[PDB]
Amino acid sequence: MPTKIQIVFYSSYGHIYKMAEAIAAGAREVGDVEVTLLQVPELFGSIPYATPEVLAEADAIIFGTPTRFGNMCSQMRNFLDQTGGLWMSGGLIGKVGSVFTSTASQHGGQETTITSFHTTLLHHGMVIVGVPYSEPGLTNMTEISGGTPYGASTLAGADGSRQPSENELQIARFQGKHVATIAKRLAN
Amino acid sequence: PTKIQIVFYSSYGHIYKMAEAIAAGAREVGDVEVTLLQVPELGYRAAFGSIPYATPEVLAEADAIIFGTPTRFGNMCSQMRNFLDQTGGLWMSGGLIGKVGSVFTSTASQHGGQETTITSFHTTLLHHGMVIVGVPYSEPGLTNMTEISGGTPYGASTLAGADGSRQPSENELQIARFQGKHVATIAKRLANN
Amino acid sequence: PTKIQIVFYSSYGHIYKMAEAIAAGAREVGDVEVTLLQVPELMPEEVQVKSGIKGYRAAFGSIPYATPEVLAEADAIIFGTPTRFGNMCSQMRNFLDQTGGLWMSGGLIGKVGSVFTSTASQHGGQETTITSFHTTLLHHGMVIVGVPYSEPGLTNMTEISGGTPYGASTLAGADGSRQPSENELQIARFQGKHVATIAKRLANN
Amino acid sequence: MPTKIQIVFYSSYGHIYKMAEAIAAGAREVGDVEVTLLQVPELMPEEVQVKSGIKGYRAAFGSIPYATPEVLAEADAIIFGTPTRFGNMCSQMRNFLDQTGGLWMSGGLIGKVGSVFTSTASQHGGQETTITSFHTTLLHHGMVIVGVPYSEPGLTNMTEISGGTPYGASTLAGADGSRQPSENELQIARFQGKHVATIAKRLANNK
Ligand SMILES: Cc1cc2nc3c(=O)[nH]c(=O)nc-3n(C[C@H](O)[C@@H](O)[C@@H](O)COP(=O)(O)O)c2cc1C
Ligand SMILES: Cc1cc2nc3c(=O)[nH]c(=O)nc-3n(C[C@H](O)[C@H](O)[C@H](O)COP(=O)(O)O)c2cc1C
Ligand SMILES: Cc1cc2nc3c(=O)[nH]c(=O)nc-3n(C[C@H](O)[C@H](O)[C@H](O)COP(=O)(O)O)c2cc1C
Ligand SMILES: Cc1cc2nc3c(=O)[nH]c(=O)nc-3n(C[C@H](O)[C@H](O)[C@H](O)COP(=O)(O)O)c2cc1C
Numbered sequence: 001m002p003t004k005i006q007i008v009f010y011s012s013y014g015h016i017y018k019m020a021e022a023i024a025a026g027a028r029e030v031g032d033v034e035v036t037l038l039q040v041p042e043l044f045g046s047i048p049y050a051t052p053e054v055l056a057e058a059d060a061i062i063f064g065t066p067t068r069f070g071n072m073c074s075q076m077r078n079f080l081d082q083t084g085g086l087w088m089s090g091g092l093i094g095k096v097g098s099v100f101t102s103t104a105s106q107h108g109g110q111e112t113t114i115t116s117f118h119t120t121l122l123h124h125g126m127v128i129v130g131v132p133y134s135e136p137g138l139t140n141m142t143e144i145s146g147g148t149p150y151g152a153s154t155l156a157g158a159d160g161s162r163q164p165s166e167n168e169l170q171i172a173r174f175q176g177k178h179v180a181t182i183a184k185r186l187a188n
Numbered sequence: 189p190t191k192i193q194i195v196f197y198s199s200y201g202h203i204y205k206m207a208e209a210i211a212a213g214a215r216e217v218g219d220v221e222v223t224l225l226q227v228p229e230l231g232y233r234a235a236f237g238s239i240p241y242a243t244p245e246v247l248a249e250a251d252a253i254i255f256g257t258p259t260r261f262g263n264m265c266s267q268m269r270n271f272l273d274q275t276g277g278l279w280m281s282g283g284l285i286g287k288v289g290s291v292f293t294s295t296a297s298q299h300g301g302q303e304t305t306i307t308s309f310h311t312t313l314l315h316h317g318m319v320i321v322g323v324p325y326s327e328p329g330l331t332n333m334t335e336i337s338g339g340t341p342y343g344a345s346t347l348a349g350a351d352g353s354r355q356p357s358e359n360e361l362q363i364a365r366f367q368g369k370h371v372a373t374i375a376k377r378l379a380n381n
Numbered sequence: 382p383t384k385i386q387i388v389f390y391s392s393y394g395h396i397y398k399m400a401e402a403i404a405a406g407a408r409e410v411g412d413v414e415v416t417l418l419q420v421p422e423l424m425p426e427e428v429q430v431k432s433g434i435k436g437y438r439a440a441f442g443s444i445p446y447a448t449p450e451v452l453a454e455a456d457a458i459i460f461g462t463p464t465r466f467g468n469m470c471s472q473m474r475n476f477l478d479q480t481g482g483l484w485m486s487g488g489l490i491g492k493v494g495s496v497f498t499s500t501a502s503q504h505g506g507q508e509t510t511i512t513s514f515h516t517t518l519l520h521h522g523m524v525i526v527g528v529p530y531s532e533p534g535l536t537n538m539t540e541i542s543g544g545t546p547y548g549a550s551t552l553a554g555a556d557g558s559r560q561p562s563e564n565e566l567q568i569a570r571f572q573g574k575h576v577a578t579i580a581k582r583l584a585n586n
Numbered sequence: 587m588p589t590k591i592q593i594v595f596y597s598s599y600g601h602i603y604k605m606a607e608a609i610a611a612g613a614r615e616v617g618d619v620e621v622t623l624l625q626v627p628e629l630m631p632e633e634v635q636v637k638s639g640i641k642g643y644r645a646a647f648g649s650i651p652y653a654t655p656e657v658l659a660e661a662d663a664i665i666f667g668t669p670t671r672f673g674n675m676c677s678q679m680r681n682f683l684d685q686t687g688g689l690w691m692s693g694g695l696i697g698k699v700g701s702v703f704t705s706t707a708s709q710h711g712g713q714e715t716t717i718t719s720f721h722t723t724l725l726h727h728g729m730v731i732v733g734v735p736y737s738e739p740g741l742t743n744m745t746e747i748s749g750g751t752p753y754g755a756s757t758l759a760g761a762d763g764s765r766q767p768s769e770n771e772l773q774i775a776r777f778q779g780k781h782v783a784t785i786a787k788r789l790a791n792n793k
Binding site for chain 1: 279315319321326374
C-alpha cells in the first residue's frame with residue numbers, strides 16, 4: 001500500500017517519547033506499513049511537527065500524551081482544537097485511532113486520560129482500538145506497571161525520574177502491532 | 189457471510205424499535221447475516237417474544253455485536269449488566285478480541301445519560317478487546333437542530349420521554365440504520381481480511 | 382462571605398452568557414461574593430481577527446484573568462468551557478495545567494467544584510465534556526456538584542434544550558447562531574444557586 | 587443528631603467487604619456519627635453460588651443486613667463498594683440501583699454525599715473507570731461527589747503495587763482473587779471514610 005500509521009505525541013520529560021518508540025517498533029513488525037512519528041508543538045531532528053492537514057493521510061493515528069489531572073495535556077489539546085477543518089472534511093472517518101499515556105501516580109489518570117481521549121477520536125469518526133488481554137503484561141502482579149486495556153501507559157513517579165519498564169514497553173509494542181494489523185486489514 | 193448480532197434489552201419497546209432499524213441498516217450490506225437476540229429478564233416484551241434469547245456463549249460466533257440498552261442513571265441496565273457479567277469465560281479465552289463492538293441507547297430526558305451510558309458501555313467492550321465503532325458526523329441526523337432528537341457520535345439513541353410515551357423519531361431511526369450499515373461495513377472488511 | 386469564582390473561556394460568547402446566568406443564581410444566596418474570571422486566549426492574533434472571535438471576546442474584555450494563585454481564595458469554583466470534541470478547550474486546559482503548585486499545596490482540597498458547557502450539536506459532548514472535566518476537579522480534591530433533577534428544566538421535552546444532571550449546558554448550533562434559551566439559562570441560574578448554597582453550608586462550618 | 591453514614595456494597599469473595607470495614611473505621615473517627623454497613627442482594631443462581639464457592643465466601647459476612655432502596659434516604663452520606671465487572675459496577679449493584687427510581691423521582695438522595703470504592707483483578711483494568719461510571723449514577727441522584735484528595739500520601743506510593751485513586755479507594759484482588767487488601771489500600775480506604783464523614787457532617791450540621 002503501504003498502510004500509513006502516524007504516531008502523534010507530546011513528551012515533557014521523555015516518558016511519552018520512549019513509549020512512542022515502542023509503539024513505533026511494534027507497528028514496524030507488520031509488513032507493508034509506513035510509520036511516521038509526529039510531535040506536537042509547545043504553546044533539531046527530523047520528527048516533523050504534526051499538522052491537521054497531514055493527519056488526513058493516515059490509515060491509523062496513535063496518540064500519546066502525558067496526563068494533566070486525568071485529561072490529555074494542553075499541548076495535545078491545542079493541536080486537536082485546530083482540526084476543525086479536518087473534522088468538517090470527514091478526514092479521519094473510519095480511520096483507526098488509539099491512545100497511550102503517562103502518569104505520576106499509580107491510578108492518577110492512567111485510565112481516565114485515555115477514555116477521555118477516546119471521546120475526541122469518536123467525534124472524528126474513528127474506530128477505537130485499545131490493548132486486548134491477549135497481552136500478558138496487562139495482568140502482571142509482580143511489579144508496579146503501567147498498561148491498560150484502553151491503551152498502553154507508563155509511570156513517571158512523583159519527580160519524573162522513573163524510566164519506562166520492560167513490561168510497559170512490551171505492552172506498547174503490542175499496541176503498535178495490534179493497531180497496525182487492524183488498520184492494514186481495514187485498508188486492504 | 190459476515191455475522192452481525194444485535195443484542196438488546198427492551199422494556200417498553202423503544203430499544204426494540206431501534207434494534208430493528210439497526211438490523212435493517214446492517215442488511216443493506218452485501219453478504220451479511222443479521223440476528224436479533226434479546227437479553228433475558230432477571231406485554232410490551234411479548235410484542236417481540238419470538239426473538240430468541242441471547243446467551244453469553246453465542247457471542248463468539250459474531251463478527252460484530254451491536255448492543256442496545258435503555259439507560260439506568262447513565263449506565264447500562266442491570267439486565268444487560270448481568271448478561272455481560274456472564275462473559276467471563278469468553279473473556280478468559282479472548283473470544284471477542286478483534287470483533288467490532290457498537291452500542292445504542294434510550295433515555296427519558298435530553299441529556300440524562302444519552303452519552304455517558306454509551307461511553308461506560310465502551311469501557312466493557314474494550315476489556316473484551318473489541319474494536320469500537322460509533323456514528324460518524326457524515327450522518328446528517330447528528331447535527332439536526334430543528335427537532336428534539338437522539339443520536340450521538342458515540343452511538344445511536346432515542347428519547348422515550350418522562351412517561352415513556354414518546355416513540356422513536358424518523359431522524360433517530362435513520363441514524364440507527366446508518367449505524368447498522370456502518371458497523372456491518374467495517375465488520376465485513378475485517379472478516380474478509 | 383462565601384466566595385464563588387466562575388472561571389471560563391468563551392470564543393463567541395455562548396459560555397460567557399451562561400456564566401452570567403450562573404453568577405445571577407449564585408447571587409441569590411445571601412452573604413456571597415461572586416466573581417467572574419476568564420482564562421487567557423491561545424489563538425494567534427491574526428486568527429482571532431480573521432474568525433471574528435476577537436470582536437466577541439473584546440465584549441467581555443473587562444473581565445480579569447484567572448490566575449492559579451487566586452483560585453486558592455475561593456470556596457467554590459464553577460468552570461465554563463465550550464466543548465472541543467467532547468473535552469474541555471485548550472485554553473481552559475492550559476490554565477489548569479498551570480495549577481501544579483496549587484495542587485502540591487492542597488489548595489483546592491475540600492472546595493466545591495462544578496462545570497457548565499456549550500456544544501454545536503444535541504449530543505456531541507453535552508455530557509462527556511463535563512464528566513471529563515470532573516476528572517480534573519477530583520485530582521484537585523474538590524467536592525463535585527452538578528444539577529439535581531429537582532430542576533424541572535432538565536426534563537423538558539417540548540423544545541430542544543441543553544441542561545444535564547452533570548452541569549448546565551447550552552446548544553450553539555452548527556453555525557454557532559443559536560443563543561441560550563430561557564430554559565438553559567434557568568438551569569444555569571439553578572446551578573449557580575445550588576453550588577453557592579452547598580459551598581456556604583460547607584464554609585460556615 | 588448523629589451524622590449518618592451508610593456503606594453499601596456487593597462482594598463475591600470478600601475483598602470489597604474488607605475495604606468496607608476499613609471505610610467504616612475511618613468514618614467512625616469523626617465522632618457524633620453512626621456508621622452502618624449494608625450489603626446488596628445476590629443475583630447469582632443458587633447452584634452457581636455453591637459450585638463457584640461464592641456461597642461460602644459470602645457467608646463470611648452473611649449477617650450484614652441487606653440494603654433496600656428506601657433505607658438509603660436515611661443517610662447523610664452513602665459510600666458504595668463494588669468489584670469491577672469489565673470497568674463497570676457489578677450487576678448485583680446495578681440491579682439494586684435500578685430499584686432506586688422512587689428515590690430518584692422523590693429527590694430522596696439530593697444533596698447527600700456520595701462516594702465509591704472498588705476492587706479489580708489487574709492494575710489498570712477498571713480501577714478508575716469503574717468509579718467514574720459509578721459517579722454518573724450518583725450525579726443523576728443529585729448527590730455531592732467526594733473522592734480521595736492527594737493529601738492522602740498513599741495515593742502517590744511508588745514502592746509497592748497498590749490500589750487507591752483520587753476518585754475513590756480501590757484494592758487489587760489479583761488475577762485469581764488471591765491477593766488481599768494491603769495496609770496501604772486499607773489506609774486509603776480509612777482516609778476516604780473519614781473524609782466523606784467530615785464533609786457529610788459539615789453539610790448535615792448546616793441543615
Ligand atoms: C475546534 C472545535 C471543535 C468543536 N467540536 C464540537 C463537537 O465535536 N461537538 C459539538 O457538539 N460542538 C463542537 N464545537 C462547537 C463549540 O463548542 C462552540 O462553537 C460553542 O460551544 C460556542 O461556545 P462559546 O461561544 O462560548 O465559544 C466545536 C468547536 C470548535 C472550535
Ligand atoms: C501540570 C501537571 C499535572 C499533573 N497531574 C498529575 C496528576 O494529577 N496525577 C498524576 O498521576 N500525574 C500527574 N502529572 C504527571 C505527569 O503526567 C508526568 O510528569 C508525565 O507522565 C511525564 O511524561 P512525559 O516525560 O512524556 O511528559 C501531572 C503533570 C503535570 C505537568
Ligand atoms: C430505574 C430507571 C431509571 C431511569 N433513569 C433514567 C435517568 O436517570 N435518566 C434518563 O434520561 N432516563 C432514565 N430512565 C428512563 C429510560 O431509560 C427509558 O424508559 C428507556 O429509554 C426505555 O426504553 P425501552 O422501552 O426499550 O426499555 C430510567 C428508567 C428506569 C426504569
Ligand atoms: C465477570 C467478571 C469480570 C471481571 N472483569 C474484570 C476486569 O475486566 N478487570 C479487572 O481488573 N478485574 C475484573 N474482574 C475481577 C474482579 O473484579 C475481582 O475478582 C473482584 O474485585 C473481587 O472483589 P470481591 O471479592 O469483593 O467480589 C472480573 C470479575 C468477574 C467475575
